[PDB]
Every structure is written in C-alpha cells, then in structure tokens.
Design a protein around this nucleic acid. Structure first.
Ligand code: P5E
Ligand code: MG
Lengths: 913, 340
DNA sequence: ATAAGTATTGATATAAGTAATAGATAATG
DNA sequence: CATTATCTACCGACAATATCAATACTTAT
C-alpha cells in the first residue's frame, strides 16, 4: 500500500532502518518480476479489459481501445507465425542459386536466422507498443518517421531477445545486430501490423451529406515532401489519435525503463551498472566505435574509479512521489481547463478564413505559413497534454513506493538518469512531484535555507540572502492561504517562476509555521543550489582573471554579482539611448530587455555561437512577453546586433581561451597520423583526416569528440529503402564541427567533473545529493555542509592549471602527426626542415621514428618512380617558393594565465546560491 | 532607332550571376519569324511588353526594332547589367527599371501601388492581345522560379489575372526536358503534368543538336524547333538552353486536390496503380478499387497516366467520404520538440 | 570453341519562395 | 591568386527515396 506515510509515522530511526530493509527485500523481488513480465502483464491486462468490455457493450471508448489492441494482436499472431513457418521451412537450404529472386533471395534468407530466435507473441506485442509510443515524432503531423519506427522496433525486439538470453543464462546456471538486419526485421513486422490493423471510422459522404461509418486501416504507409527531399511516414488514423490523448494510455503502452524500486546495480565496470537486466553503458555514445573503444580502454585500466563513485552516489538517493502535489495536479488535469502549462482539452484546430485564389501570391504564402503555425501549436499542445498524462500515470503508479534512479553519462560526463519518461530532471511538474524519501530535521540553518529556497523559486534569487529571508517572512499569509486550499483561493503559488515546486515548498513551510519549534520538524523538499553563469565561472578560473572572477561571484562579496544582469543593464542603457535617437526598432524593445533574454545569448556567446543562433535564441526568449513577432525573425535581427556590440568589449580571457581551443581544434583536425597508415589511401594526393580531438577528464574519464562525417546509404526493406547510417563505418572528421564544438565540450566536461567530485564527497559525508548539471539538491538541513563541499571540490579541481595540462596532453598524444602544410607564410621553429628529410641514422635500437616517417613521404607523390629526389625538391621552399608541404603539427602557445588565487572562493557564500 | 548591343559590348560584362543569354541577331530574327507574333497582337502600337530578367538586352532591342510596342519594361536588378542597360538604352523608348523581378512584391508595387506599368485585363477565352511577357530564367539554380510562375496559371493570381498572357521563356535544357515530356517517357514527372494541365507549350529554339534526344519524337517533328550551336550564347559554360512559348489554356478541375493527388502519386511513379493508391491516405486501395471501374487503368503506373486520368482520380478523391485532410500535408519541421 | 542476368553502386530528380531564416566562411579552379 | 556552397554553439536526439544507368560477376553455352 502506501509505504511512505507509514514509514514517516515511525518515531525512531532504527525502526525506520528495519522497515527499509523489509521493504527493500520485498521490492527486490518486485523489481525482478517487473522487468521480465512487463510485456506479459500488459498483454494480459488488455486482453482482460477486452473480455470485460465484451459483456457491457461495444462502443468506441478506452475499453474499446484495449479491445482494438487485443484484436490487432490476435489477427497479427497468425501472420507472423506463418512467416516463422516459412522461415523454418526454408532455413533448410539446398542450393543458393534457383531461389525466389525477390521474396526469399534478399528478403527471407537474410532475416531468416533472426526470426527463429524469439517467440512470436513477444514480437507482436513489442511492435504494437513501440509503434504507438512513436506517435507524432520526427516531424510528422500525426504519425512517425519510417526510419525511426523500423529501427526502434528492430532494436526493441533485439534488446528483448538479449534480455531473454540474460534471463536464460542466470536461470540455467549476433552480438550487435547490424543496422541492415534490424531494418529488415522492423519493416517486416510493422508491415504485418499495417496489413492487420483496422479501426472503425465514421465519415460524411460529399454529394448527399449523409453520415457513413466504415472500417479502415489503423496505420498507413505514405510519403511526405519537405524541402524537395521526400520523406517516408507512417500515419495513424485520427480516430486512434483521439484515443491516445486519453487517461488509460499507460495501460496500453507500458514503460519498461521506469525508476527501479531497488538500489541500482552500483557501477563497477563500464558494462554494468544501474539496471539489472537491461545493460546500460556508461556513455551515451551515439554512433561511434572509437568512443566506446577509448572508454573500454579506460575501464580496463581502471583509472576512472572516481566517475563510478560519483554515479553511485548520484544513484543511491531515494525519492518518493509527493502526494499533495499529485493531488493538486490531478484535480487540475481532471478539471480540463488550461492551467499554467497543461494546455487544456482541444478537439481540432480552427484555421482562419482561406484567402481567395486570385490574391497576390504573397498573401497565399502568408496564409500557408499561418496554417503551419496553427498546426504546430495544436500538435505541440496535444503532445504536452499527452506527455503530462503519461507522467501523471507513472506518478499515480508510485503514489507511495520509494524509487531510485540509475544515472548514466553523455559523452562529456554530465549525469543523466536512465529513465527517460519520468525523472527529476524534466520540466517543472516532474520536479514538483518528487521529494526526498529520507526526511531530516530542519534545524537552525535548515529553516532559513528552506525559506531562501522558497524565495529562489519566486524569481527573487537575485538579491542577497537576508533579502530572500525577508521576502519569505513578509508573505506568511500568502503561504498559509496557498497551502490551505491550492485552488479556490488567492493562488499565490501560481505567480511564482517555478509553479509546482513553489506550491510544494509552500506546503512544507505551512507545516513548519504550525510548529512551536521549527527545528524539530522533519522536511523532505530538496533545496536547489543553482549556479550563476557556471560556464563563465569555469572560464574565469581557467584563465585566472581577477575582474572576471569578481563579476562571477568567485571572490567573496556581500552582494551577488551575475554577469547576465550586468550586461543586460548595459544593453538596456544603450538601447534606451538608441530608441531616443530615433529608431523605431528600439522603442518597442527598450524596456523588455531583462536578465532572462540576455542570459542565453551571453552564455552561448562565450561558447562560440553563430549569429543565426543568437537571433533565434533571443526570438524564442522574447516571444512570450509579446514585444515583437514570435513568428518573425526580422524584428529580432537588430537586437542581437546590439547585444553582440555590447558583449564584445566585456570578455577577454574567455575569448582568448575559446580562440586557442578553436585554433587547436582546427590544426588537430587537419592533421594526419604517421604510424597507422603506411599506405596512401590513393583517393588523391591529399589523404583523409580521421584523427579526432581527444582529451581526458580531470577524473580520468576519456572524452573523444565523435563529430565525424557520417555515411548513410539506402538499405532495402519490405516497406521502403531507408536512408540510415551504419555505426561501424569509420569516416573522416568534420573539421567545422570539431572547431565549433571543442570549447563547449571542454567547459561542459569541467562542469560535469566538478559535479562528480562534489557528489563523491557529499556521498562520502552521508548526504543524499541530486544534481541537474549545474544546480545541486540536498535536504534543507545539510545544505550548509553541501555549500562547504561545493567550494572545496572546486578548489580541488582548479588547484592545477587545466588548460596547460590539456595542451601538454595534446602535445603528447599528437606529437608524431604531420599537419598538411599549404603555401608558406612564415617560420616558427627550426625542426620542420629535419622533418622532410629523415636521413639522420638510427643505429642500434629504437627511435625508429625516421624509418616510419620516411615511407610516408614516399606517399606524398614524390618526384620519383628516387631517394634523394623529394628532399631536394623542398630545399627551394625554405631558401622561397610555396609547396603543399608536410610540416609537423605544432599546437599554439597557451594564453598567459593571469595571477589570481582561486583559493579566495572558499569564503564566498554567493558562489552557489 | 534603338542601338542593339553586339558581342563587343556584352563581352565586357564580367559578372552574370549564372545566367546565359543569346546575342546573335540572325537567330533572334529567325525566332521572331517562327513565332509570328504579328498574328495575335495585330496592333503592336498598343501592346505593352513586360520583360523579366532581360540581362544583356539584345532580345529587347530586336523586339522593339521589329514591333515598336507601347511600353517595354526591363526588370533587371543586377549591378553590371543595370549599368549596361542605362549606358546603352539611355533616353531610348525602352523603359529600364532597377527592380528585382524575383520577389512577388515587385509586381504588386508596379501594377497596383505605383501604377508605372498598367496592362489591360481581358477575358479568359482568347490569348491576350494587349499584354506579352518575356523572361530569361536560365540560371541552373533558379529553376524553382519557373515552377512558381507555372503554378500561378493554376491560381490565376500573379500576372495571369489579365487573362491568358503569352510567355516567351528561355530556360535550361533540363527544365525544358522536364516540362515537355509526354506520358511514359523517362523524364515525365509532376512538373510535366502541371505543364500539360495548365499550358500547351512549344519548343521554339534549342541550343544543341544532341538535346533533341530527350523530347518526344512526334512532338519534336510537330514543333520543328530552331537549332543553333553552343557558340551562340555568350557565357559558354553552362548547359544548353531552350526557348519555350507558354500560353495558358482552360481547365475545370480542383487545383488543390489535383496538386495533392499528383504530388503523392508521382512519388512512386513506377509501381502499378494496384499498390500506389495507398499512399493517398488511409484505406485508399480498397476504396479506389471499389470506385475505379476500368481495370485496364489499374495497370498503368502513374508515370503512364495522362492528365485526364489524374483529373479522374482527383474526382474520385474528392468523392471519397473518408478522404484525409489535404491541408495538413506537411512536416512540422518548425517546433516538433518532443520533450518527453 | 561462346552471352544474359545481376547484387552492388552511383547519379539524378524530387518541391518550389533560396527548408520556418541570409552573413560568415572554409575550400576548390 | 580569385571565387564559391555550406550552416548556422554544444548536450540529452533519434536519420530522403525511387528510379535507373552502369559495374563487376557469375554463371554458364
Ligand atoms: O544553451 C545553453 C544553455 C546552457 N548551457 C550550459 O548549461 C550550464 C548551466 O545552464 P543554465 O544554468 S540553464 O544557465 P546559466 O548560464 O547557468 O545562467 P544562471 O547563472 O543559472 O542564471 C552551463 O554550463 C551552460 O554553459 C549551454 O551550454 N547552452
Ligand atoms: Mg545555472
């Protein structure tokens, strides 16, 4: 039943530990059954619903939806079993010459061995679930992309097969399916579903205007043109979309990867951690063999143990669904009216009056654009309502039980939960629902910090801590009113910046206000240490700036200084004088410029944002307040121009480090390795560039930028030819993306490293810790200890100069490379000349370096068939005349690191608050 | 007496933005005799010609010297070409305007707002006698503009609100091969069906001898197109060009449903109609089997269909009770974010 | 002593306001 | 040395196809 309330009822902590142990073992068994029997339980649930509905009657409702699911399954099982029958009847081949040239030749003999390995009902249910889940993705209006659907279903069947194998291996005591086989299997199964699924529909005949009802296919395979490049789509009947925006959707399409009720499998190797049976790799490596190869080398060497410590501390923190906030959101959802973010029930979009054909082409184009805008808004609201429905259903499932989230890393190292649907790292509603399972007494610091958190939520995070406490104290009546009745009241919590977390903390504060001694109260709501321009903090620390560090709350201060606000004010003053000057673009926008609008452009700007991106970012941020056209970008163009003009003067160290990183990335990307290749690829005089930017995280995790130039090809399926890319094809690197992406990835790696160090330390102290990249959460009691730990670990991360260590690591990894040199501009040092010759003898031992290198020169289209030929050719260049030379890659000189003790942050309380 | 620019002057212009023009006066005289424009515009002393993308302005000078229309508007918004036109046709009765003809707004401003060029609207039964439009859309990248100008005939909106205005269009040879393909040829696509449904277009002159291998043989015999060598166009880099006379005709289909049906059938232009009608919505094959009565038509792959069969299929599509929504036929590339 | 598919592959067209936007800018001849 | 075709900061994410011109390849007669 409800475990959380009874557990809280317990007076003594030891009793709590006994209760936790008993629930932990019973939840071990419960989680074990949950993973394997998810599909069987779901299929049994809908077949039961179908049988139950049969007695009552046959109307088009949610029970009918389940009836439809059991009917599609029931009439799809025979087709797939006939396919399996012909697969086993033909897997006993005799001669591979006279075969069915289409249906068996490439189709059935290719996927034959893969259909036998798994029983059919699992494949059918998986295809239905996985096709419904992809509803309205990939840009389709009310369907999915065919490539995404085929690959997702093939991958889900393969992964379910691998779960079956894991279970069989634990019970009794290909490796990675290629993309082509996954595509063929997925296409065949979704084809069968297309050819079985039929749903009743009602239509109006045109000539007589008499309604007619009929049965039509539930799924259909069509195509759609964008930008000239045709796209394949799978459209779902609108009658079924009406029923997917329904409360009972979660029963039909079950979530397999949901928060587990047992302690995650603690991370001991890159291959194992968190989830029990579904293997989860430590890196969300998208499409790279190199990324996993380097991670594997690291794990085998074992030098990343601190990453494991951070992930194990991040994962072992227990949550619980907030019951009161769940009640309020359920009331609001059932009410049906549009709330703060839940868009509200909508039947079908209304389009403006269509313009007459004879109108100027621009008018028709404008109307078509407006139709696209209206359709996008309607599909967005529908998707938001469906997502909220899914989230509220998962929340309803766990109303009492306590849950753990298993964390994983993307390729930089930031920690992202494994559960994609519902997690504390989603939008505001998801955060409001979750509270820390462990409750700790507030205490003297705790009560004040809880108040400061409530002030933070309401947008008053700018002012000093005392002002935040004063703000919380001044609005005690509002807190009691909002807490007593969420709705049918003043609704003060709604005005807050973060709407749901604000009500949750209001409930906590109301309980606190009813106690004579607040410290004795035990609290659950996590307090957020959000971080002011964290990327700027890291740039200032790396460069060693003093003025820059001062602006970014690094140095101890009485009042918090945030760069975004300062630049926003500067821009405001300049825009105000500009509007007075006489331009009309500024007068409308003179005031609206606030911290929120500027912050996105400033952050991206330090990171190398192209101007188009800045124009869009600002357009989206300023669209709500309605000071310019949300649709149009023309009004927003000037504003970004001024933002860039004001910003350029501000930044010096960040620009220096970003420029050095960009230059290093370009030079390293355009470099060619000596050792691996002793053969010219013969594609041309200029070989391909397959060397990628790689550096190590201060924790020891390896980071390899996977910005390659992907090679897609059309592999044939039963439905269509899908334009997919094979992950095993190694390809040259996209120099443009390497150069544009090194700075942000470096700063994000440093940010994630600081998080993992601080997480390991907090978990060592015994404080549960949850972190959304750059804001750390802990109970309002231990917030002071966490505050100490953050600063301390930042020190432990920046005690050593990191940019210099990175440049040294680059020089070590990329010493024996030979950057392709174009016509000369000047000389830097005097070892380039010895590079071309490689005639110095290497006798009696290693230092083979000349031997491998000289043969590479032979691959530079030497003037020969011989030995003294090319060496003579280059003598003129040094003595004069440009050539496409082979000079040794030389990384730039790092910027001068200004003198600034990073250790002065230990006494700044506004660094993280 | 308009002075015609020769190869000497037009050799001096360094930039052309990719447009290839023609400069030989002999082939232009031959072309204007082949077209025989003095049959429809019997009183040229009242005709008003609107020349889009004139460029070098040789066709314009020859046209004026032969017919003397009342108003000849050269809409060329390009630096070197505009300078050329103002240094050669200065004071000349030609009307040289520095206006981009690409943007729709140019026509609205010219005819509607400023009333510099005001032609006379006539009925939609005879090819207009007081308005002639000539255009040189020859850039290899600026082909979609021709498609927009063709689509305007269907809507009767852009310049075809003056009835049936005849167009003299220079165009890449690849565009002329697309537009002028007959049913079943290899180069038959939806551009060809649009051309067939809205216009009847003849090949007046081509810039190559080995290009006639892409057009229909009987139609190539019927048109009798003028030929010339590739040494006649002045920028001699790009592919050969082809002049096409394009006069709108009558039509009584629904242009929106016809667009949908044709665009979605001509995606799979080689699968027989047994299985290509399922891309037109949910349950398309069953319905279009119950409705189409001529089971010989069901074996014509949609590249084999003439336009009349497409009008028939769109009639069945608009008769469909369960027809899908024609207006939400796009991909929401703008903001399908998919946060969860 | 004597040829026709054929799995693989590569080019081209696709829609049509330069994808919902337009200034850099690395990269060939 | 003069002139142009890509994108538009990065991460969680998640992608153009049909057709046919022609190829190397195995069949085999
Ligand atoms: O668009 C973005 C947004 C954020 N980030 C990166 O995510 C991190 C924090 O993202 P945010 O906390 S929200 O934005 P802040 O820059 O921190 O403003 P604040 O001081 O909180 O008022 C931070 O490392 C930023 O560089 C991006 O890289 N790109
Ligand atoms: Mg932050």
């Amino acid at each position: 039943i409800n475990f959380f309330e009874i557990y809280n009822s317990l007076p003594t902590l030891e009793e709590k530990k006994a209760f936790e142990s008993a629930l932990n073992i019973f939840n071990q068994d419960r989680q074990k059954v949950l993973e394997n029997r998810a599909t069987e339980a779901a299929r049994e649930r809908w077949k039961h619903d179908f049988e139950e509905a049969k007695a009552r009657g046959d109307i088009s409702i949610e029970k009918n939806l389940n009836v439809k699911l059991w009917k599609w399954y029931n009439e799809m099982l025979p087709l797939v079993k006939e396919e399996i029958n012909h697969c086993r009847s033909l897997l006993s081949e005799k001669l591979s010459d006279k075969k069915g040239l289409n249906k068996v030749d490439t189709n059935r003999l290719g996927y034959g061995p893969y259909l036998t390995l798994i029983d059919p009902g699992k494949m059918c249910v998986i295809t239905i679930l996985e096709l419904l889940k992809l509803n309205s993705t990939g840009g389709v209006i009310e369907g999915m992309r065919t490539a995404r659907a085929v690959i997702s279903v093939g991958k889900a069947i393969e992964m379910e097969f691998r779960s079956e194998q894991v279970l069989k291996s634990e019970s009794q005591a290909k490796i990675l399916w290629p993309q082509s086989i996954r595509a063929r299997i997925g296409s065949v199964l979704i084809s069968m579903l297309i050819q079985v699924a039929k749903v009743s529909v009602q239509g109006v005949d045109p000539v007589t205007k008499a309604k007619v009802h009929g049965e039509a296919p539930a799924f259909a395979h069509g195509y759609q043109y964008h930008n000239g490049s045709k796209l394949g789509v799978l459209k779902i009947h609108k009658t079924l979309i009406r029923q997917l925006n329904g409360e009972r959707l979660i029963a039909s399409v079950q979530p397999q990867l949901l928060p587990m009720l047992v302690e995650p499998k603690p991370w001991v190797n890159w291959r194992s951690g968190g989830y029990h049976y579904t293997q989860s790799t430590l890196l969300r490596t998208k499409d790279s063999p190199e990324q996993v190869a380097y991670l594997k080398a690291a794990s085998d060497n074992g030098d990343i143990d601190r990453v494991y410590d951070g992930l194990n501390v991040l994962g072992r923190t227990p949550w619980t669904v907030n019951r009161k906030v769940f009640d309020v959101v359920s009331q609001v959802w059932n009410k049906g009216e549009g709330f703060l973010d839940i868009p509200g029930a909508q039947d079908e979009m209304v389009l403006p009056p269509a313009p007459p054909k004879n109108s100027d082409p621009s008018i028709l184009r404008a109307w078509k654009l407006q139709v696209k805008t209206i359709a996008n808004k309607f599909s967005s609201d529908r998707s938001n309502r469906c997502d909220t429905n899914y989230k509220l259903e998962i929340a309803r499932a766990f109303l009492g039980e306590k849950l753990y989230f298993p964390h994983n890393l993307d390729f930089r190292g930031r920690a992202y939960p494994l559960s994609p649907h519902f997690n504390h790292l989603g939008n505001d509603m998801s955060r409001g629902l979750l509270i820390f399972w462990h409750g700790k007494k507030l205490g003297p610091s705790g009560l004040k910090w809880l108040k400061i958190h409530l002030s933070n939520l309401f947008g008053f995070d700018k002012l000093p801590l005392k002002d935040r406490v004063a703000f919380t104290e001044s609005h005690l009546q509002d807190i009691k009113d909002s807490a007593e009745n969420p709705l049918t009241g003043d609704r003060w919590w709604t005005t807050a910046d973060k709407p749901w977390q604000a009500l949750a903390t209001c409930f906590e504060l109301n309980e606190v206000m009813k106690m004579d001694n607040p410290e004795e109260f035990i609290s659950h709501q996590p307090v957020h240490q959000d971080g002011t321009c964290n990327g700027l903090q890291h740039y200032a620390a790396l460069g060693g700036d003093v003025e820059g560090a001062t602006q970014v709350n690094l140095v101890p201060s009485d009042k918090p200084q945030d760069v975004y606000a300062h630049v926003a004010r500067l821009v405001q003053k300049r825009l105000e004088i500009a509007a007075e000057k006489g331009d009309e673009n500024a007068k409308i926008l003179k005031d609206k410029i606030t911290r929120k609008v500027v912050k996105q452009t400033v952050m991206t700007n330090v990171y190398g944002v192209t101007y188009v991106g800045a124009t869009f970012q600002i357009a989206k941020q300023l669209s709500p307040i309605f000071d310019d056209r949300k649709e149009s970008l023309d009004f927003s163009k000037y504003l970004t121009k001024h933002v860039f003009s004001a910003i350029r003067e501000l930044f010096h160290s960040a620009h220096l480090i970003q420029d050095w990183l960009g230059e290093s990335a370009k030079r390293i990307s355009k470099s060619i390795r000596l050792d691996v290749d002793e053969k010219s690829f013969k594609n041309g005089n200029k070989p391909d560039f397959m060397s990628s930017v790689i550096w190590t995280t201060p924790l020891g995790l390896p980071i390899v930028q996977p910005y390659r130039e992907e090679s897609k090809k059309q592999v044939e399926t039963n439905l269509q030819t899908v334009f997919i890319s094979d992950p095993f094809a190694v390809n040259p690197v996209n120099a443009r993306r390497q150069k544009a992406g090194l700075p942000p990835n470096f700063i994000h790696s440093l940010d994630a490293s600081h998080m993992l160090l601080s997480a390991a330390e907090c978990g060592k102290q015994g404080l549960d810790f949850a972190s959304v990249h750059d804001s750390y959460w802990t109970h309002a009691s231990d917030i002071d200890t966490m505050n100490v730990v953050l600063r301390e670990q930042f020190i432990k991360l920046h005690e050593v100069d990191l940019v210099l260590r990175l440049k040294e690591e680059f020089d070590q990894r990329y010493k024996n490379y030979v950057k392709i040199g174009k016509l000369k501009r000047s000389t830097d040092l005097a070892q380039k000349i010895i590079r071309i010759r490689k005639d110095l003898s290497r006798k009696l031992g290693r230092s083979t370096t000349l031997a491998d290198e000289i043969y590479f020169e032979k691959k530079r289209q030497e003037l020969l068939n011989e030995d003294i030929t090319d060496l003579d050719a280059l003598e003129l260049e040094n003595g004069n005349s440009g050539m496409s030379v082979l000079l040794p890659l030389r990384l730039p000189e790092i910027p001068p690191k200004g003198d600034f003790d990073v250790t002065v942050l230990r006494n700044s309380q506004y660094f993280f608050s | 007496s308009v002075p015609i620019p020769g190869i000497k002057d037009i050799s001096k212009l360094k930039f052309f933005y990719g447009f290839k023009y023609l400069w030989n006066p002999t082939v232009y005289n031959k072309i204007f005799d082949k077209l025989d424009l003095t049959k429809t515009y019997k009183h040229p002393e009242e005709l008003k010609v609107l020349d889009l993308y004139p460029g070098v302005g040789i066709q314009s000078a020859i046209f004026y010297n032969k017919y003397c229309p009342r108003q000849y508007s050269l809409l060329e918004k390009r630096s070197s070409l505009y300078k050329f036109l103002n240094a050669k046709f200065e004071g000349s009765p030609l009307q040289i305007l520095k206006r981009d003809p690409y943007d729709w707004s140019t026509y609205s401003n010219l005819i509607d707002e400023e009333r510099i060029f005001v032609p006379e609207v006539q009925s939609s039964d005879h090819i207009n006698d007081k308005f002639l439009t000539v255009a040189n859309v020859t850039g290899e990248g600026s082909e979609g503009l021709i498609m927009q100008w063709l689509s305007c005939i269907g809507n009767k909106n852009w310049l075809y609100r003056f009835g049936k205005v005849k167009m003299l269009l220079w165009m890449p040879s690849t565009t002329a091969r697309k537009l002028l393909a007959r049913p079943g040829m290899h180069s038959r696509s939806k551009c060809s069906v649009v051309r067939e449904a809205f216009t009847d277009t003849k090949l007046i002159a081509i810039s190559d001898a080995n290009e006639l291998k892409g057009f229909d043989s009987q139609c190539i015999e019927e048109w009798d197109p003028i030929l010339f060598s590739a040494a006649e166009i002045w920028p001699t880099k790009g592919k050969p060009i082809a002049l096409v006379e394009m006069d709108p005709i009558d039509f009584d289909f629904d242009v929106d449903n016809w667009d949908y049906v044709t665009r979605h059938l001509m995606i799979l232009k080689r699968t027989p109609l047994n299985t290509v009608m399922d891309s037109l919505g949910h349950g398309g094959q069953q319905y279009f089997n119950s409705r189409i009565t001529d089971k010989d038509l069901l074996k014509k792959c949609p590249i084999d269909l003439t336009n009349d069969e497409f009008i028939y299929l769109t009639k069945l599509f608009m008769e469909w009770p369960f027809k899908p929504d024609i207006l939400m036929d796009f991909v929401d590339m703008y903001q399908t974010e998919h946060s969860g």
